[PDB]
Every structure is written in structure tokens, then in C-alpha cells.
RNA sequence: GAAACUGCGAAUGGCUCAUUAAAUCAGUUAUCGUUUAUUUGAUAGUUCCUUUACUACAUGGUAUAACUGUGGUAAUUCUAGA
RNA sequence: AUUCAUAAUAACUUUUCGAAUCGCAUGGCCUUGUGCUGGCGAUGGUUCAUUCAAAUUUCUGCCCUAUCAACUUUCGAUGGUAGGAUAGUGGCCUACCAUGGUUUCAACGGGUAACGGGGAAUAAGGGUUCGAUUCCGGAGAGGGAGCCUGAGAAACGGCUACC
């Protein structure tokens with residue numbers, strides 16, 4: 020089927036190569052997963068040496084890290100808003116690595132409440148002493164404050180759904196967030 | 208055609224010829240898994256209810272469940288499916304199988320009784336066929352006899368007697384999954400081994416930590432002065 | 434092609450096995466084990482070809498299946514088990530023990546040892562790594578892993594294994610003026626003392642070795658096996674002590690012996 | 694101890710030289726760019742329903758082969774129903 | 776030489792493994808019982824290492840031919856970025872971008888009554904010719920393609936299709 024051998028390519032001089040051998044199993048490729056959103060559906064593919072892989076088809080939730088606070092939360096994915104490789108992936112909401120998505124902002128809001136208690140967006144001393152000690156770190160970033168106000172958070176996918184079967188990622192921050200804001204998510 | 212009919216509650220079987228093909232038409236355009244009434248099938252099956260279990264057409268091709276056609280087709284058959292026994296690991300073969308829908312081309316129709324009729328038959332319901340052999344697993348015998356849970360199964364294992372002409376001797380199946388002191392010994396051996404390996408590892412780690420503490424103190428207190 | 438090979442054609446077997454060209458199309462292919470098949474001695478080769486305790490592989494199998502032979506304290510009924518350098522072979526009958534060491538002509542020589550020496554063995558440190566749960570370990574030349582080693586044990590050192598429990602009882606660092614044994618190349622079987630070594634960052638550290646009677650040679654670091662200090666080796670040397678006399682003076686010794 | 698289920702092997706061997714001209718191959722490299730049954734050494738006291746469900750671990754149940762029978766096909770290492 | 780080995784933190788998972796398996800022996804301690812505790816094994820079982828390997832890969836080296844001088848690149852050619860796929864690197868493939876890459880030091884094309892090598896015949900030296908064939912490596916199983924099972928096959932005394 021799909022083959023990864025370099026034999027079929029032209030030579031670096033531009034010459035056509037003569038057929039050397041039949042396609043080998045140890046050089047095969049497989050078709051893309053094309054991971055969609057919603058109604059989780061994983062398929063397992065058996066690979067070389069056993070070592071099964073997980074094809075993520077139409078999954079809806081993933082684990083996303085907030086690298087500034089050192090926490091990762093399980094949160095569902097709203098949609099794909101940017102892909103640096105192909106705009107068709109954005110149009111079809113295909114979930115791949117490096118894809119820019121919006122997720123939920125809700126588990127992160129609730130953790131922020133429980134950890135700092137700053138009623139972000141619009142009891143006993145046991146928690147109050149902890150909140151006072153964790154103060155001076157309550158302020159984070161205006162650009163993510165506004166996304167919390169909007170109710171969804173910009174994230175970048177860092178896992179490979181077609182390989183591991185999971186769509187995990189991290190919240191966009193700092194220069195990366197400002198860059199992706201300029202690129203397509205803003206300026207229409 | 209022929210009707211291979213089986214009465215399963217006693218495991219009895221017989222084959223019935225039905226000529227005058229204007230009467231097997233009750234089966235026509237039916238499929239495996241559909242009940243049929245026996246009065247139309249014949250005057251002997253008054254009230255008897257048959258259901259289609261299978262069949263074989265002329266040329267002997269078996270009928271496949273799910274193939275909703277009155278004709279036979281070729282199919283790529285795989286392991287653990289009907290009409291094909293693989294001869295190798297992962298071998299799949301293309302074979303012709305008859306469709307599931309009953310038609311005039313069938314030579315034998317395999318039927319099973321689901322409801323008893325009004326009369327009795329010469330070889331189906333008047334007799335019985337005993338089961339080949341009884342339960343072998345411990346809880347299978349315990350369920351079969353249904354006495355209790357705290358009961359010996361050695362005495363309730365079913366025994367069969369075989370005569371060699373001069374001496375008759377009984378034999379019974381070897382009970383599986385039976386709890387035994389040997390199994391208990393194996394289990395406690397594995398348990399003790401896991402525990403013992405845990406202490407061995409902890410002791411080795413403690414000794415290594417002692418060695419590192421000794422070297423860390425000595426090799427650095429000796430070089431502090433220099 | 435399509436998978437691992439299971440046959441070893443004769444004339445493709447290692448030359449140091451000293452197999453007769455005729456009398457067979459095939460040679461005993463060593464099974465997977467502690468040693469590479471190029472520098473290993475199968476049990477059938479040691480028992481039939483070297484010791485003449487068997488006439489053929491059928492009698493070799495008859496010997497092994499009686500639990501008579503044991504390698505490094507374990508029975509090892511495998512006919513083609515890859516016993517290699519420094520290994521200890523024990524025969525329950527005949528009350529003898531053997532240690533597999535090359536003679537100076539680069540082949541395993543039948544070398545008998547005592548029970549005290551058969552109780553232990555040496556190993557060359559191939560790597561020192563931190564295992565799971567932060568536990569350090571070392572890997573010897575015979576594919577053996579020993580957890581919790583001495584912190585000063587570095588790569589290509591020598592460790593002494595108790596051979597009844599896989600534990601290190603002593604170790605020798607790799608340093609100038611230590612008796613080494615050559616285990617590869619054209620210098621198989623030589624025993625000498627390290628003069629110095631050449632660094633050569635980028636691969637193939639080079640070691641200069643001086644023989645007992647002042648024959649200087651150089652060898653790759655991969656073929657160097659420390660076995661003790663200047664004098665007093667940790668292992669009983671085979672007959673010859675690895676000196677590599679020239680062919681003229683081997684002739685002279687042979688004639689002196691034969692003609693009295 | 695037939696048969697059959699399970700496991701392992703059947704990717705070795707043997708044969709031939711059609712293709713193949715930087716391809717194969719040879720010597721020499723690299724894997725800090727990966728897979729690895731088997732062998733050998735080491736190597737799992739954490740399993741609490743994804744807690745106010747520890748309910749059998751003196752040990753959970755299903756579903757089948759072989760076999761008993763009814764058979765189809767001219768025919769194959771074809772197989773159906775019970 | 777490393778973002779290495781390891782180790783820690785926050786979670787994640789059609790929740791992987793963590794022995795409901797088998798054979799000989801059947802001792803010790805009494806709480807005297809389908810009591811406790813017990814050896815030598817066999818078969819398994821994550822992970823690391825090892826071995827047998829495998830796959831890709833650096834440099835250099837092939838016969839005749841110019842009555843073959845330009846070749847490659849929309850259908851990837853040469854690079855970049857990102858993704859997908861793979862066991863894994865890689866235009867292996869995809870999207871976008873740049874216009875690159877090889878060549879008289881012979882590219883590209885054509886021919887080979889070409890499998891390569893260890894080697895063989897001859898041989899003052901230098902050479903010439905041969906190597907389908909006992910060993911090594913490659914390829915194939917009428918021709919193609921596709922695939923299942925498996926650690927390992929694009930297997931053919933495996934399957935599927937077309938000829």
C-alpha cells in the first residue's frame with residue numbers, strides 16, 4: 020500500500036530509478052486519522068513488533084496544561100480556530116498537532132477559585148491563610164483574563180491524536196499567544 | 208425436499224421426505240430464524256411449530272445467516288464464522304454460500320421444533336437421546352446437581368462403567384478448578400516470594416544508602432583540609 | 434531475509450572452533466545467550482571436539498539431558514549454549530572444572546581449574562547506568578546486570594562475581610601498569626601490562642601493552658580485559674601465559690620436546 | 694494414548710540469477726534516528742468498586758472443539774442443523 | 776557532545792502489567808483442623824540490559840556508448856516551516872512558501888549475450904580475461920498488485936483479485 024521507501028523518488032541528479040524490489044512491509048505507511056470533534060471513537064492499529072497505536076477519531080475532550088500555574092485540567096474542546104499547515108483543517112475542525120483550539124476555561128476557572136479565590140472574570144481561615152500566602156501570584160495576564168471573560172481559552176495541541184489516540188495541549192501564553200492572536204484569530 | 212428436523216430438548220433427530228412440492232411453499236420466501244406452522248407443512252405436524260435453523264441447496268452449498276438472497280454468492284470468509292474452517296493462522300478464503308432466504312432450489316431444510324404438537328412422531332418425540340457426558344468443572348457439577356455450595360463434588364462426579372468382557376470398571380472425569388492443598392501451597396508460595404523479594408530489595412537499598420553515606424562523609428571530610 | 438537465521442553453514446563458523454571441513458555441511462549455530470556467537474564456544478563443540486567425552490551430537494545431548502554439565506553454576510541443557518570468555522564449565526562426574534580462556538593462538542583452550550577458582554569469575558564492565566527507581570547497575574561482558582555497584586566502578590573495569598549470587602566481591606580499575614588480557618583482534622590470547630592509552634576523542638581508544646618479556650604491541654580498547662596487577666593475576670593463567678613465541682622458537686621447543 | 698483445543702514452528706532451510714549500472718555489493722561508518730519473538734541477567738508488598746458495592750480468593754462463568762447422531766453435494770484437506 | 780540516563784510535580788487513559796497455571800517431594804510447629812508454615816522446578820509476566828537480529832545510514836570504489844549535451848521541476852524536482860504517516864530519520868506524503876538540484880572531473884539517455892563480492896585462469900614485472908555455480912550479501916517463486924496472521928513475510932509447498 021502506502022510506502023515510505025525512497026526508491027520511487029527521482030535521484031538527486033534528477034534521474035529516474037529502476038525498480039529494485041517489491042514493496043516491503045517494513046517500509047509501509049498508513050492513512051491519516053483525520054481526528055474530528057465529538058462522540059469519542061478510538062481505533063487500535065497493531066504496529067511493528069506488536070506495539071499497538073491508537074487512532075483518535077472524533078474525540079471531544081483532552082488534558083490541557085496551564086504552564087504558568089503548573090496544573091493540567093481535563094477539559095473538552097470547542098473547536099479548531101487555526102492550523103499553521105492547512106486552513107482546510109480549520110474549516111473541517113480536524114484535530115492534529117500544533118492545531119490552535121478553544122477549550123472550556125471552566126475547570127481552570129474553578130481551580131483558580133479554589134487556589135486563589137479572586138472571583139476571576141464576571142470561608143474559614145484554613146483556606147484564607149492559604150489564599151493570603153498564595154497572593155501576589157493571583158495576577159496572571161490580561162490577555163488570558165479576557166479569554167476567561169469570554170468563557171473559552173486558546174490552546175495549542177501538543178499531542179498527536181493519530182498516534183497516541185489523545186488530544187492534549189497547553190494554554191497559549193505570552194509571545195505565542197500574542198502571535199497567534201495577530202495571525203488569524205484577530206483581524207478577522 | 209428433505210427436512211432434517213431436530214427436537215432439541217431430548218436431542219432427537221430425523222429426516223422427512225416431502226414430495227408434492229406444492230406444499231413446501233409454506234417455507235418459500237422465509238429465512239433462518241423465522242417460525243413456521245406445521246399444519247401446512249403436513250398433516251402429521253398438527254400444531255407443531257418449526258423454525259428454520261439452516262439448510263443445503265442442490266450442489267450441497269450451506270446456507271449463511273444474514274445473506275438476504277434466494278441465490279448463492281461468493282464471500283471472503285474468516286475465522287470463527289460458519290461455512291468455513293481455517294487451515295492456518297489468519298487464513299481467509301473465498302467460498303460460495305447459499306443465501307439465507309428459503310427457495311425451491313434447497314435440497315435439505317434444517318428445522319428445529321420450538322413447540323410440541325398434538326400427536327407423536329415415530330422418531331422425534333417418542334424417544335430421547337441421553338447427553339454424551341456430564342459436567343467436569345467443579346462449579347459446573349455443583350450447578351448441575353444444585354444441592355448447595357458447601358458440598359463434596361468427588362462423590363457427585365458422574366461415573367461411567369465399561370465392561371471388557373471379564374471385568375467391568377468405572378471411570379469419572381478429572382474435576383477441574385477444584386480447590387486443593389497443592390493449589391493453596393502454590394498460592395502461599397507465590398505470596399511469600401513476593402514478600403521476601405520486597406524485604407530483600409529494601410535491605411539492599413538500605414545497605415547501599417549506608418555505603419553512600421560513609422563514602423560521602425569520608426571522601427569529602429578528608430579533602431576539606433586540603 | 435524475512436527473519437532470523439537458524440542455520441550456520443560450515444566454513445562460516447568461527448575459525449577458532451577448529452572444525453573439520455568435511456564430515457558435515459553445517460556447524461552448531463550458537464543460540465542467543467550471554468556471548469556473541471563469533472566469540473562464543475558452544476557446549477557441543479567443547480564436549481565433543483575439545484574433550485572427546487562424546488562421539489557425536491547425540492551423545493552430547495545424552496550428556497546434557499542428564500544434568501551432568503553446568504555452566505556458571507546452572508545446568509544449561511542446551512546443546513548450542515553460547516559459553517564464552519571467562520565462563521566456568523563444571524562436570525559433576527570426573528570431578529573437574531574448566532575456565533574458558535583463549536590460548537595465545539586465539540582459541541579457547543581446555544584449561545582445568547580448582548573448586549575455589551570455579552566458585553567465582555571475572556567480568557568486564559560494559560556500561561554503568563541508572564536503572565528504574567534510580568537504582569544504579571553495571572553490565573558485564575557476559576550480559577549480566579548487577580544492581581547497586583561500587584560508585585568508583587567505571588566503564589571497562591573488572592569485577593569479581595561470586596557466581597553463587599550475582600554479587601560483586603572486588604573490582605580492578607583500568608589504569609596504567611595493570612595486567613590485561615586481549616580478547617579480540619590479531620592479539621587474541623596475549624597477556625601483558627598496560628603502558629599507556631591514547632585518548633582519540635571520536636572513537637577507538639588505543640591501549641599500549643607490554644608483554645612479560647618486553648614485546649610491545651597496541652590494541653583497541655574494546656579488546657582489552659583487565660585481569661589483575663603487575664604480577665599476581667586474579668585468574669589462573671592457561672599453559673603458556675600468553676607470550677606469543679615466534680614460529681622459529683616454537684619449532685625449537687617442539688623439537689627439544691619430541692627428540693628429548 | 695488416537696482425535697481435538699491450546700502453545701510453538703512453518704519468515705529457517707533448499708533452489709535459481711529474471712530484474713538490477715551509485716542500484717546490488719565490498720571495505721569503512723552511524724543510530725544522540727528506531728523495532729526486536731527467543732536466550733541470558735536483573736526486575737512489580739501499592740490492584741480500594743474511576744470509595745461512605747471488598748460481594749468467592751479453600752479460587753468467578755460461558756462457549757466450543759474433539760465426540761453422539763440427522764444430513765447435503767458428482768466432486769476438494771467442503772461442510773449444515775441438533 | 777544531548778531536552779541523555781534517572782528523579783520530581785499537575786493531571787490524562789475502549790485502563791497495559793502487577794500468577795484464579797502445572798509436575799515431583801510432601802518436611803517443621805501444634806491452636807488437632809477442608810490448622811499455620813514449607814522445597815526443587817515448569818510455564819508465563821510489564822520494564823531495563825544482553826544475545827540472535829532488522830531497518831535505515833557516512834565515505835570511496837562499477838562494463839560499453841556523444842550515431843546520447845544538457846537533465847530534473849504542472850503528476851516533488853532542490854530546500855524551508857508545519858502537520859500526517861512510520862518502529863523510527865527523511866519530500867516518505869500533504870499544505871504553504873522559495874527556485875532550487877545534477878552536468879564535458881561526462882550528468883541525462885541507450886546497451887549489457889550485467890546479480891555484486893570472497894575468488895578463478897593465465898601470469899618476469901606491469902597486466903589480460905573470467906566469476907550462473909559449494910561461502911557471504913541481494914532478489915525472485917508464471918507476471919503484476921494487495922493483504923491477513925505473526926517478533927519477524929508485502930510469504931507464495933499463505934490468502935485475494937486481474938492477466
Ligand SMILES: [Mg+2]
Pocket residue numbers: 434
Ligand atoms: Mg532463504
Ligand SMILES: [Mg+2]
Pocket residue numbers: none
Ligand atoms: Mg517533519
Ligand SMILES: [Mg+2]
Pocket residue numbers: none
Ligand atoms: Mg519538509
Ligand SMILES: [Mg+2]
Pocket residue numbers: 889890
Ligand atoms: Mg541479469
Ligand SMILES: [Mg+2]
Pocket residue numbers: 906
Ligand atoms: Mg558469483
Ligand SMILES: [Mg+2]
Pocket residue numbers: 915
Ligand atoms: Mg522473497
Ligand SMILES: [Mg+2]
Pocket residue numbers: 925
Ligand atoms: Mg510467532
Ligand SMILES: [Mg+2]
Pocket residue numbers: 932
Ligand atoms: Mg514448490
Ligand SMILES: [Mg+2]
Pocket residue numbers: none
Ligand atoms: Mg518457501
